[PDB]
């Protein structure tokens, strides 16, 4: 399956920020931090969200993002985690990892373990005030059980929007191949706004973790 990069809807460094303090095609809101190599979305402070949006809309049939980040603090807990999205529009803050309880599209959450470890597909076809601590486990169209903090190399989430399924594959980061990924989680039948905006964004509460994102690289599927 042919894959086109995307550059309109991606970042990756070197120099990833330019001398304005801005990420070309995107937009960073809250308290994200963009830097040479990386965007820290949500730093290791108490009651931090922070997000970053592409500016424009994307119109692909059949789509691909390749987003490389860690999640990194103190001890076997953390909070709160991060969440990518593919949504209608383009995502303001809120309780949702960082974003709005509200958005057309998908969501895929990585939610830490503060005492659940899991990463989360979840729909919403802007009818759903969603909030995570009571409806994660009742509204997941898909999920599965990884711990992505803390680990030796960058962790590597692959989603893919191909055919009407949702596929997520991860690399949990013991290994520093772009390319080795393992299946998390797919949804099939999943419809998605024929046009949207891609994102990304983070949290912390009481507990609190640096989340940064290195690279997130969208592609344009084809057939």
């Given at each position: 399956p042919h894959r086109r990069f995307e550059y309109k809807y991606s970042f990756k460094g070197p120099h990833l920020v330019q001398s304005d303090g801005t990420v070309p095609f995107w937009?960073?809101?809250?308290?994200?931090?963009?830097?040479?190599?990386?965007?820290?979305?949500?730093?290791?402070?108490?009651?931090?969200?922070?997000?970053?949006?592409?500016?424009?809309?994307?119109?692909?049939?059949?789509?691909?993002?390749?987003?490389?980040?860690?999640?990194?603090?103190?001890?076997?807990?953390?909070?709160?985690?991060?969440?990518?999205?593919?949504?209608?529009?383009?995502?303001?803050?809120?309780?949702?990892?960082?974003?709005?309880?509200?958005?057309?599209?998908?969501?895929?959450?990585?939610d830490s373990f503060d005492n659940n470890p899991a990463i989360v597909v979840v729909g919403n076809n802007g009818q759903i005030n969603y909030d995570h601590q009571n409806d994660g486990a009742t509204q997941a169209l898909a999920s599965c059980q990884r711990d992505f903090r803390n680990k030796p190399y960058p962790v590597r989430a692959k989603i893919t929007y191909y055919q009407k399924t949702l596929t997520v594959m991860i690399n949990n980061g013991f290994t520093p191949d772009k390319n080795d990924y393992e299946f998390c989680a797919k949804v099939e039948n999943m419809v998605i706004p024929t046009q949207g905006h891609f994102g990304i964004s983070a949290a912390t509460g009481g507990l609190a973790d640096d989340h940064d994102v290195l690279s997130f690289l969208t592609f344009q599927l084809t057939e």
């Open positions: 937009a960073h809101a809250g308290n994200a931090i963009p830097s040479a190599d990386q965007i820290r979305i949500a730093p290791s402070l108490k009651s931090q969200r922070g997000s970053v949006w592409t500016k424009t809309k994307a119109a692909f049939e059949n789509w691909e993002v390749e987003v490389t980040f860690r999640v990194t603090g103190r001890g076997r807990i953390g909070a709160d985690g991060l969440a990518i999205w593919y949504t209608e529009n383009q995502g303001l803050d809120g309780p949702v990892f960082g974003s709005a309880d509200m958005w057309n599209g998908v969501g895929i959450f990585f």
